Amino acid sequence: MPNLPGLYFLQAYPSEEIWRLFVDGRFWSKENGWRGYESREPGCLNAALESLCSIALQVEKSGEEFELSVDLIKRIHKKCGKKVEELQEKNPGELRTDEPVSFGIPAGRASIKGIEEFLSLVFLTEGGAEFGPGKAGPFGPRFDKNYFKNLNPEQIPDLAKQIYFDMCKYGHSNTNHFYLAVMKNVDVYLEKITQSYNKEIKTAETLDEKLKIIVKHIRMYEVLAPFRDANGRTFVNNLLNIPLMQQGLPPATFYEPNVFDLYSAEELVVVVKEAIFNTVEIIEQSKRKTPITLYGYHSSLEEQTKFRDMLDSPSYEKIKHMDFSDLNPEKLHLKTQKCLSSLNEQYPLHRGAIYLSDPGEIKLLLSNRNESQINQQIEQGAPPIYVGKTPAHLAVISGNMAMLDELIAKKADLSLQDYDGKTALHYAAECGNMQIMGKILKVVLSQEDAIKVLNIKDNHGKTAFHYAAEFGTPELISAL
Amino acid sequence: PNLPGLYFLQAYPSEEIWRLFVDGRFWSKENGWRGYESREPGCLNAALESLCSIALQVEKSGEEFELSVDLIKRIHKKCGKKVEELQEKNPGELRTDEPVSFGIPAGRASIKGIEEFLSLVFLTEGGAEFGPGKAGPFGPRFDKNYFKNLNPEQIPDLAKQIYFDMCKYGHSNTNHFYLAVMKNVDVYLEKITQSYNKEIKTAETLDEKLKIIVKHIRMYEVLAPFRDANGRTFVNNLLNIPLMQQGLPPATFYEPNVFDLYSAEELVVVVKEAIFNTVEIIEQSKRKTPITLYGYHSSLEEQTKFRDMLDSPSYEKIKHMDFSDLNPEKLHLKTQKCLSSLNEQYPLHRGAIYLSDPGEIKLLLSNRNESQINQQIEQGAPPIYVGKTPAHLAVISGNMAMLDELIAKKADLSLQDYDGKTALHYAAECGNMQIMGKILKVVLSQEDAIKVLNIKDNHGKTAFHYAAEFGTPELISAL
Ligand SMILES: C[N+](C)(C)CCOP(=O)([O-])OP(=O)(O)OC[C@H]1O[C@@H](n2ccc(N)nc2=O)[C@H](O)[C@@H]1O
Numbered sequence: 001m002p003n004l005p006g007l008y009f010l011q012a013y014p015s016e017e018i019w020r021l022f023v024d025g026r027f028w029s030k031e032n033g034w035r036g037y038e039s040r041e042p043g044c045l046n047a048a049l050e051s052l053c054s055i056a057l058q059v060e061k062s063g064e065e066f067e068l069s070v071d072l073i074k075r076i077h078k079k080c081g082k083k084v085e086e087l088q089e090k091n092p093g094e095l096r097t098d099e100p101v102s103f104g105i106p107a108g109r110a111s112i113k114g115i116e117e118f119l120s121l122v123f124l125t126e127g128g129a130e131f132g133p134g135k136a137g138p139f140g141p142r143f144d145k146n147y148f149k150n151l152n153p154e155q156i157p158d159l160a161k162q163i164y165f166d167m168c169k170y171g172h173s174n175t176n177h178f179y180l181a182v183m184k185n186v187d188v189y190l191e192k193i194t195q196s197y198n199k200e201i202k203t204a205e206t207l208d209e210k211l212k213i214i215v216k217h218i219r220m221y222e223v224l225a226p227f228r229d230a231n232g233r234t235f236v237n238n239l240l241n242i243p244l245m246q247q248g249l250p251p252a253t254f255y256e257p258n259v260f261d262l263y264s265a266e267e268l269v270v271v272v273k274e275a276i277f278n279t280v281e282i283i284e285q286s287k288r289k290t291p292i293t294l295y296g297y298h299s300s301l302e303e304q305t306k307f308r309d310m311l312d313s314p315s316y317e318k319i320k321h322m323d324f325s326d327l328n329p330e331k332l333h334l335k336t337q338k339c340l341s342s343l344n345e346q347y348p349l350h351r352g353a354i355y356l357s358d359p360g361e362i363k364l365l366l367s368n369r370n371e372s373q374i375n376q377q378i379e380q381g382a383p384p385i386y387v388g389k390t391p392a393h394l395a396v397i398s399g400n401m402a403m404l405d406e407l408i409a410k411k412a413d414l415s416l417q418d419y420d421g422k423t424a425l426h427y428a429a430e431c432g433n434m435q436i437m438g439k440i441l442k443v444v445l446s447q448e449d450a451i452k453v454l455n456i457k458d459n460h461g462k463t464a465f466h467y468a469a470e471f472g473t474p475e476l477i478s479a480l
Numbered sequence: 481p482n483l484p485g486l487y488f489l490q491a492y493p494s495e496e497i498w499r500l501f502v503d504g505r506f507w508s509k510e511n512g513w514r515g516y517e518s519r520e521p522g523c524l525n526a527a528l529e530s531l532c533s534i535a536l537q538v539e540k541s542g543e544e545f546e547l548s549v550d551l552i553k554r555i556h557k558k559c560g561k562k563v564e565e566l567q568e569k570n571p572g573e574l575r576t577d578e579p580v581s582f583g584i585p586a587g588r589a590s591i592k593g594i595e596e597f598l599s600l601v602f603l604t605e606g607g608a609e610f611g612p613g614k615a616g617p618f619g620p621r622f623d624k625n626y627f628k629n630l631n632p633e634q635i636p637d638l639a640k641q642i643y644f645d646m647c648k649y650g651h652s653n654t655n656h657f658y659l660a661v662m663k664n665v666d667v668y669l670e671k672i673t674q675s676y677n678k679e680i681k682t683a684e685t686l687d688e689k690l691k692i693i694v695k696h697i698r699m700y701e702v703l704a705p706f707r708d709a710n711g712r713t714f715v716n717n718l719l720n721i722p723l724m725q726q727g728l729p730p731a732t733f734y735e736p737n738v739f740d741l742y743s744a745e746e747l748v749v750v751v752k753e754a755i756f757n758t759v760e761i762i763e764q765s766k767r768k769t770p771i772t773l774y775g776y777h778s779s780l781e782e783q784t785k786f787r788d789m790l791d792s793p794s795y796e797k798i799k800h801m802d803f804s805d806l807n808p809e810k811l812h813l814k815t816q817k818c819l820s821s822l823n824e825q826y827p828l829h830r831g832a833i834y835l836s837d838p839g840e841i842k843l844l845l846s847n848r849n850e851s852q853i854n855q856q857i858e859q860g861a862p863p864i865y866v867g868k869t870p871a872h873l874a875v876i877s878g879n880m881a882m883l884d885e886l887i888a889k890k891a892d893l894s895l896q897d898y899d900g901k902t903a904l905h906y907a908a909e910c911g912n913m914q915i916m917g918k919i920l921k922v923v924l925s926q927e928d929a930i931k932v933l934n935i936k937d938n939h940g941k942t943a944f945h946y947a948a949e950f951g952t953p954e955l956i957s958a959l
């Protein structure tokens with residue numbers, strides 16, 4: 001009986017696409033896939049892949065059934081810091097004590113049920129964690145209000161609606177709300193979360209119950225930030241993928257993994273399922289030898305060879321040359337297909353705009369859909385990509401020609417601004433897509449308020465053409 | 481050495497060798513050489529083999545290089561090898577009574593070009609046809625044939641009229657047709673060969689030799705001796721040999737299809753401008769600088785596809801050839817002096833094509849007036865310049881630094897070239913988001929924004945029709 005039956009998918013994951021497990025999908029189009037990610041912290045991608053593979057290999061080899069331990073978490077973090085200069089500074093492998101860890105949270109990484117769960121965390125009140133509106137200051141956040149100071153728990157539901165509304169008022173992608181983590185008993189809290197996980201997992205019978213326990217605890221580990229940095233990589237890109245692979249599910253390819261603080265466990269199950277679905281889509285697209293185009297990104301032969309030359313992960317090679325003969329791929333595939341089915345009947349057009357490429361399937365999806373349905377903007381709680389976006393915004397960010405063509409035919413309002421004040425045009429300019437932009441402009445110029453639509457300003461007071469004029473520009477002090 | 485210029489053929493980077501045959505005008509829109517190869521599979525490999533095999537032949541023979549019909553016939557056989565499109569019309573064999581006709585647009589013509597053309601006695605004598613008309617079931621349907629009862633005294637004014645008429649139809653549109661000679665092509669081919677060999681020994685200077693070279697390559701093109709492959713044979717192959725005999729590099733053309741209706745003097749400039757392209761490709765490659773000429777940036781995929789496609793044993797022989805008893809500095813100094821003529825003609829336009837340094841650009845545009853910055857080059861200049869502003873050219877070339885400077889000097893971005901295209905139309909066609917966004921910001925900061933965006937070219941297309949058409953395949957495909 002295998003320990004991590006899901007390792008099948010880690011091997012099935014194409015070598016030249018392996019970086020997708022660590023690099024947020026949100027970066028792909030704008031940062032040459034993984035290039036922007038590796039450049040901020042050279043070495044990280046090799047370190048993160050080695051961490052995931054070496055530890056997966058540790059648990060698959062042991063006779064004991066997999067149980068969470070702080071030593072394991074500590075090893076994961078040490079492994080994520082190897083060769084990384086940016087992470088050597090804050091000592092990897094060792095825990096935080098009284099060192100402060102603070103960060104800002106925008107509306108786009110939050111939900112009302114998320115904020116309710118967050119304020120309801122007794123270890124946040126007990127540990128003296130801070131949360132509320134303010135500004136970034138000289139020595140950390142300058143809080144106007146701290147919601148954990150004299151928090152009446154009865155008030156939590158209405159306060160969560162107010163905190164969310166306040167966060168939106170500032171801007172979906174703007175940071176007004178700050179979080180200062182616990183500076184006492186982090187070692188006790190890390191052990192208590194570990195204890196809770198190990199105890200609760202044996203309680204869950206269904207796969208969907210196990211997923212809620214898994215995310216519920218990964219969230220508590222993220223919210224408690226036990227290390228100075230590499231908290232995300234350690235818990236969501238590493239730790240999380242092991243119990244997923246223990247259930248025989250693939251690892252998670254995230255668009256925006258930075259939602260484990262202010263999203264609810266139920267909403268995180270969906271976020272994780274969507275991310276498991278991206279691994280399935282990459283693997284299937286690679287099997288059928290179809291160029292992978294997820295999240296509007298088309299890799300170049302130059303990007304692929306550079307990554308292949310940069311790849312150095314001995315434990316990943318061990319997994320790639322590993323035997324899976326006494327493992328049924330069909331049953332494994334059928335289990336994840338059934339697990340993922342929940343994602344099917346939810347925002348059909350939006351998911352269509354992200355995943356659907358066949359014009360016949362697209363034409364059928366958009367048949368008998370009304371004006372409110374085709375112009376629908378998903379509300380708070382759905383995975384971050386959907387929030388405030390129309391099928392048209394999503395079709396533009398995905399490079400979905402066939403969906404955009406169909407939406408134009410169904411007469412979708414291309415002037416609708418998302419929660420960042422951006423139109424389909426703003427995104428076309430940012431992505432650098434000439435065809436999508438030309439297609440929208442033809443529509444815009446065939447209407448009366450053309451000049452008004454072209455001059456629509458987003459949250460940053462920028463026009464689609466400010467973004468177009470800024471497209472491709474380097475991040476270097478260079479003459480040419 | 482027989483061909484000192486072979487030095488540059490070797491100095492030409494292997495993965496860029498296709499640039500000698502593929503018109504620069506195609507590069508941006510057709511993935512460099514990809515569109516060219518796909519029209520006649522095998523053709524670039526043949527063209528290269530023809531040029532190298534015959535250059536290697538003349539260098540190896542102790543006799544001084546002299547043009548012969550056998551050589552020309554050999555070039556043509558070589559250009560058709562493994563090429564199915566060229567096998568149909570028998571390579572190496574000369575035309576007799578088989579018709580050869582094509583249309584000529586204003587953009588490939590000049591007044592001095594048309595004057596020289598009508599003045600060609602072998603065109604009148606051989607019964608060649610030229611004038612306005614339409615394409616018909618069995619060839620062009622002529623409304624007028626200028627070679628029928630041509631009074632030579634009328635030629636200068638007729639050339640102005642033919643040109644004006646050609647413009648009236650549209651710069652890139654074909655209204656004027658040419659039906660070549662169908663009698664004594666073999667005599668004319670020999671007479672042109674005889675004339676060349678005799679005239680070349682008469683020219684003392686390099687500039688005199690260049691006029692004799694083009695004058696004859698033009699007559700060979702105008703007489704179309706073969707049914708097919710006349711361009712490759714004469715301008716991409718034949719022409720490069722006497723250039724390499726003078727110690728000059730071979731010619732990298734933007735538009736080589738100007739050897740019918742351009743004058744010999746105007747063709748010297750076209751050829752010099754093409755020789756200068758080879759010099760820029762080589763120098764950029766030497767400095768490990770990515771080559772960006774004519775708005776095209778090759779992808780690693782395009783380079784490796786061409787590297788896997790390349791097969792020319794004579795080219796390899798040239799690449800592994802010795803040039804120790806050849807002074808590269810003297811060779812380089814001779815071409816620099818030869819190309820110096822090109823320096824003070826349309827400074828801003830050339831700047832827009834070649835210049836990339838912002839300091840050089842800023843200096844070039846200093847003390848330049850409104851008429852100078854918005855200047856559209858008239859008929860006679862190499863085809864790329866005709867009717868274009870420095871701004872059109874900056875956009876076609878992907879020259880960000882020049883476009884940035886032109887916007888600062890307040891260049892009119894609404895000016896239409898002779899095809900009815902604005903700087904915006906070209907930005908949409910090239911697919912450049914940054915250039916387009918930059919122009920749109922300027923357009924939207926003016927009153928007639930909506931008018932400028934709705935400017936229709938000759939094809940009745942808007943800049944945005946081209947943007948919407950950008951990247952679209954040439955295949956019956958759903959996805
Ligand atoms: C941002 N948080 C605080 C909400 C969660 C992450 O906690 P952290 O900052 O302690 O850790 P981390 O470095 O693992 O963060 C992971 C996230 O940082 C970003 N990241 C990480 C590494 C890197 N080379 N470049 C990046 O941009 C990505 O958005 C990634 O998803």
Ligand SMILES: C[N+](C)(C)CCOP(=O)([O-])OP(=O)(O)OC[C@H]1O[C@@H](n2ccc(N)nc2=O)[C@H](O)[C@@H]1O
Binds near residue numbers: 515520
């Ligand atoms: C077109 N003319 C008649 C004005 C010039 C001579 O043309 P031709 O048909 O005798 O011969 P040719 O095939 O050698 O012409 C060369 C020109 O044809 C075009 N060409 C040729 C081969 C190819 N695979 N693709 C092309 O686009 C290019 O414009 C090239 O520069």
